[PDB]
Design a protein around this nucleic acid. Structure first.
Ligand SMILES: [Zn+2]
Length: 240
RNA sequence: GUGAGCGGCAUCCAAGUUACGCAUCAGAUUCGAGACGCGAGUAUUUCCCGCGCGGG
C-alpha cells in the first residue's frame, strides 16, 4: 500500500462507482491522496462544497478526485474511519485506550494507516500518510500530523514506572492532554520536575508532539493492558 | 518554493447586604512685693607703677 486511497480496493474491495469521467489528458495527482490520475483512470471533478474545511490539506490544485477517494469521502466511510487503523488484513478500531497502547507499543508489521478524529466527523483517511515501518508511525489526529515512535513511548513509560515505583500516590511526570489542547501539554509536572534526573527530564522534553499525544492515552496511574482491536471492515461495508 | 502557505479566545456578568469607640476618673497639694546706695574723716608727701607728666 502506497497511497491513502489504496485502502479501498485492497481491504474494502469496492468496485468504482458509475457515471465517472475518464481522464484523457496529461497525468495529474488527486487533489486528496496525491495519487496520479493517468489516461484511462476513472476520476471525477471536485465538488467538495462550502462545508469542506480541508483546503489546506489538498495534495494538488488539479480539482480532480479519483474513484477510491470518492468512496472514501462518503459519510459512512468518514464515520467508520474516525478512529480506524487500516492494515493490509483489515480495518481495526483504536478508539479504546488499550487498543492505542497496543498499537503504540506492539504495532502490526505490515504497512498501515492510523486515523483519529478530534471532533464529531472529519476528513482523515485521504490525509494520513502510510506507515512504511512500524518504528516510525505516522498518526493523523484531526488536523495534526503526528509522528509516534514506539521505542520513545516505551522509554517514557519506563521512566514513569521508575519514578513512581515506590510512592503510593502515582504522579504523572509530564502533563499530557488527550486532546492535545491544553496550554500545559508536554510541560513537566512538579513531581517529575523534582523527582527525575537530568537525562530523563531532557528525554521527556525532547519527545515529538505525537508521542505526547499517545502518552496522554497510555500513561496513567493504572496503565492499560494492550489488547488487539476488533476488525471493523465488515461493519463499514455493511453500513455502506 | 522553511510539512511551508491561510486562520481574533471571542462574546455576556454589581462584591453586595447588616453593625454606637463606648462605659468609669478633682490639676490637686505649699510659700511676705518687701527689702537694698555712703554727710565714715587733715594739709602736703613714703615706699613705687608707666619712662617733664599720667597714678597706690
Ligand atoms: Zn485520491
Amino acid at each position: 500500500m502506497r497511497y491513502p486511497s489504496d485502502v479501498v480496493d485492497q481491504v474494502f474491495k469496492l468496485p468504482p462507482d458509475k457515471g465517472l469521467l475518464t481522464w484523457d489528458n496529461d497525468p495529474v495527482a488527486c487533489s486528496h491522496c496525491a495519487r496520479p490520475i493517468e489516461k484511462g483512470d476513472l476520476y471525477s471533478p471536485s465538488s467538495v462544497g462550502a462545508f469542506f474545511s480541508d483546503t489546506r490539506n489538498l495534495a494538488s490544485t488539479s480539482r480532480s478526485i479519483c474513484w477510491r477517494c470518492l468512496i472514501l469521502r462518503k459519510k459512512q466511510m468518514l464515520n467508520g474511519l474516525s478512529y480506524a487503523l487500516i492494515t493490509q488484513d483489515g480495518v481495526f478500531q483504536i478508539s479504546k485506550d488499550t487498543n492505542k497502547a497496543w498499537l503504540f507499543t506492539t504495532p502490526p508489521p505490515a504497512p498501515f494507516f492510523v486515523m483519529h478524529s478530534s471532533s464529531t466527523m472529519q476528513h482523515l483517511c485521504w490525509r494520513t500518510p502510510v506507515t512504511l515501518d512500524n518504528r516510525l508511525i505516522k498518526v493523523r489526529y484531526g488536523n495534526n500530523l503526528f509522528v509516534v515512535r514506539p521505542e520513545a513511548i516505551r522509554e517514557a513509560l519506563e521512566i514513569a514506572d521508575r519514578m513512581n515505583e515506590g510512592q503510593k500516590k502515582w504522579q504523572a511526570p509530564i502533563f499530557l492532554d488527550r486532546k492535545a489542547a491544553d496550554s500545559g501539554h508536554g510541560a513537566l509536572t512538579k513531581a517529575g520536575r523534582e523527582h527525575l534526573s537530568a537525562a530523563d527530564q531532557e528525554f521527556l522534553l525532547n519527545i515529538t508532539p505525537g508521542e505526547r499525544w499517545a502518552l496522554a492515552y497510555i500513561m496513567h496511574s493504572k496503565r492499560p493492558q494492550p489488547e488487539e482491536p476488533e476488525c471493523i471492515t465488515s461493519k463499514i461495508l455493511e453500513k455502506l
